[PDB]
RNA sequence: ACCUCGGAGCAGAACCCAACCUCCGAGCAGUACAUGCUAAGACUUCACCAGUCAAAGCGAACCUCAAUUGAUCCA
């Protein structure tokens with residue numbers, strides 16, 4: 001009993017009478033290419049994906065690369081493969097051109113949009129730069145999705161970005177102890193004149209990040225908002241809790257997001273200091289508890305099982321003596 | 325005394341082992357070289 | 366077997382059964398696997414690991430072995446440093 | 461078991477407790493045929509003893 | 510104390526949480542088929558006719574971090590977008606981009622001719638010297 | 651054609667294990683693993699057990 | 703003059719049809735040649751038998767077959783194909799049911 | 812209470828105060844448990860043995876964290 | 892003429908299915924010496940006996956073939 005296929009079958013259109021007249025995959029790599037393309041296409045049978053899922057620019061760029069390939073040391077160095085690339089120019093120009101789309105990818109991969117705005121995606125146009133002071137010599141930078149200790153983030157960071165009002169926001173998307181939905185902010189500076197931060201109205205002042213011990217690894221969001229019209233807004237963790245979605249819903253008329261930088265934290269001893277010193281509570285300690293192992297229903301006669309079978313179903317490893 | 329004689333004998337033979345292994349792998353390389361030299365003819 | 370002996374008029378145990386099997390007090394018979402010490406040179410180590418095991422018996426094998434021994438063999442035994450002693454009482458059955 | 465026997469007057473703890481006193485209080489039944497060599501104390505019930 | 514009202518079950522919805530405790534599942538299966546799906550992050554090089562391309566992906570296929578020569582920031586400092594210099598360049602750039610994404614462990618699985626290519630040995634040397642280990646830690650069971 | 655021989659450990663001794671080897675080739679020395687030393691150790695073959 | 707041929711049935715085939723809950727290590731299907739291939743969270747024994755690596759639900763799909771490059775049989779079978787021709791096989795997946803553990807509060811230090 | 816414990820030496824109280832800092836309470840109390848037995852004698856003995864082990868060791872998975880710290884210091888290479 | 896084991900048809904599509912039914916075969920060889928030790932969960936020749944597969948673990952590296960076989964006692 002045949003039922004006919006629903007859509008087109010694969011290998012139908014290429015199925016001809018003269019295969020020897022058809023040019024073939026001479027390689028392994030071409031089949032891997034075509035094969036991946038057919039993997040990504042939507043099909044009608046059941047697949048794995050169902051279940052587990054202007055002109056001046058080209059002018060100056062053409063003359064720029066045309067001037068670049070003309071030098072003799074570039075060709076001679078490149079053919080002797082000792083030519084390299086300055087990583088800094090690539091870094092800053094990456095910060096300029098196509099960096100925003102990549103920070104959009106990192107915010108989509110780290111689930112900042114599904115959690116921070118219920119899926120309202122946007123593009124971080126502003127190349128924001130945040131760094132924490134590490135003593136006096138050096139300073140730990142915050143890029144999108146880095147690991148920074150809460151010792152490094154003990155003191156409120158230096159924020160520099162090249163722009164022209166602004167409201168900057170830090171949150172902890174997961175660090176909420178009670179509610180599985182809300183998040184504790186850490187500092188919310190508003191009505192910021194230009195690109196200096198100190199003259200902002202410090203509405204909610206700076207906490208360091210506090211991830212609990214053994215509660216895994218936390219992500220911490222630096223939002224930076226284009227502000228149009230300056231609005232007035234508004235250690236108790238019942239007071240640091242809000243949600244950025246319905247916060248932003250109140251103020252989305254004259255404010256749009258323009259910058260991201262987010263990072264990870266784990267536990268450190270400074271978080272002992274945060275819970276005991278300035279929050280004044282005992283610290284909660286978590287542990288990753290795996291589910292108990294499946295064993296089938298115990299039988300009276302466990303035929304052909306080894307003698308270990310009786311130990312799968314006991315709970316004390318000590319000699320019990322019964323009525324005696 | 326049985327336990328000490330066994331334990332001592334094992335400790336002695338194990339002290340003599342790494343040299344015997346290095347000699348043995350050198351003999352393996354002689355079987356490589358002589359084997360491949362017998363492959364040529 | 367002998368159901369009534371000629372001297373005592375009692376049942377007798379089959380001594381093959383005692384020589385090969387182990388009665389745990391809960392009613393389970395433990396045995397050794399057949400061929401666990403034969404032709405080990407041609408057996409894969411998974412199979413040799415399977416043969417060196419103490420394997421429980423069937424229900425009807427168990428009742429056949431109960432009928433072939435007597436009440437002496439069905440009795441609590443408080444040995445000194447018994448290896449199988451933690452396997453006599455049956456823990457945590459839900460029938 | 462032995463705390464149980466002492467509480468119900470069956471084993472007098474103001475005398476030495478030999479094996480005869482555990483038999484006469486009927487705390488322990490031991491049979492010398494069937495080669496019991498006597499009693500072993502058991503740690504069950506060590507707390508609350 | 511009102512402050513220390515902690516829910517008995519912490520909910521961490523970091524997508525990269527369980528993978529950075531090296532606890533999360535890898536797709537263990539797929540043994541008859543190349544490549545193996547058993548990783549958390551894969552480095553996938555796409556060498557076209559004109560351009561070298563480098564990806565960092567999850568098992569989802571969500572491209573986490575990319576670096577192509579089809580990008581003005583990197584393209585203009587190069588002589589040719591396809592040579593070994595292009596791969597060492599895209600290795601430095603890719604590695605620097607991945608340290609700042611909190612990604613430190615990829616898997617790179619090449620075909621046995623792409624393994625023994627010079628440009629991918631140079632790419633791997635660029636990645637390892639950059640700071641990225643091209644081998645994931647095992648899953649803790 | 652083949653012979654089942656025993657292989658006696660040189661150290662951590664009393665440990666044997668059996669192998670196959672051809673009738674015609676030389677006396678085996680191997681690097682097997684002693685679980686008594688818990689190391690890899692040279693074994694030397696001492697007696698042919700059975701000509702399979 | 704036809705001696706032999708008295709061998710019994712191997713009792714192979716699928717043990718867990720699609721939709722069936724499966725615990726870790728259950729044999730999904732035993733085959734004699736690869737009728738089904740291991741997909742996500744499904745392992746293969748020496749006897750080409752498909753067992754399960756996670757607890758979840760068995761699903762069968764149709765996927766693009768791209769063999770390992772060191773598999774010269776199937777790779778030589780590839781390069782004879784025309785330019786659009788793509789091989790498919792049926793795969794078996796276990797969609798894992800449980801999370802692999804939760805964070806639980808342990809102590810208020 | 813680890814700080815007031817006269818019967819532990821002062822350097823050993825510092826080594827215990829540092830190594831086993833994840834057992835120490837808010838109130839400075841070293842807290843340590845055992846749930847390895849049905850008999851509370853054997854659990855108490857297990858606790859006391861943990862203490863004697865801490866004083867004797869104090870008198871006289873990591874790899875992933877090694878690498879993530881080395882890369883965090885490679886991003887720390889950013890001065891004023 | 893045969894007596895045990897395996898492959899194919901009979902038996903077209905889960906499993907099973909006979910015949911002094913139709914055709915092929917097997918009673919090994921080769922490589923390796925971690926062909927180490929342990930252990931959740933399973934399959935199973937329609938019983939039993941035998942057979943198979945196996946994650947995690949400890950210890951290390953960084954098996955092919957379909958069949959390729961023999962219980963207990965005794966030596």
Ligand SMILES: [Mg+2]
Nearest residue numbers: 707708709710
């Ligand atoms: Mg047949």
Ligand SMILES: [Mg+2]
Nearest residue numbers: 708709710711
């Ligand atoms: Mg039949």
Ligand SMILES: [Mg+2]
Nearest residue numbers: 713935936937
């Ligand atoms: Mg059956």
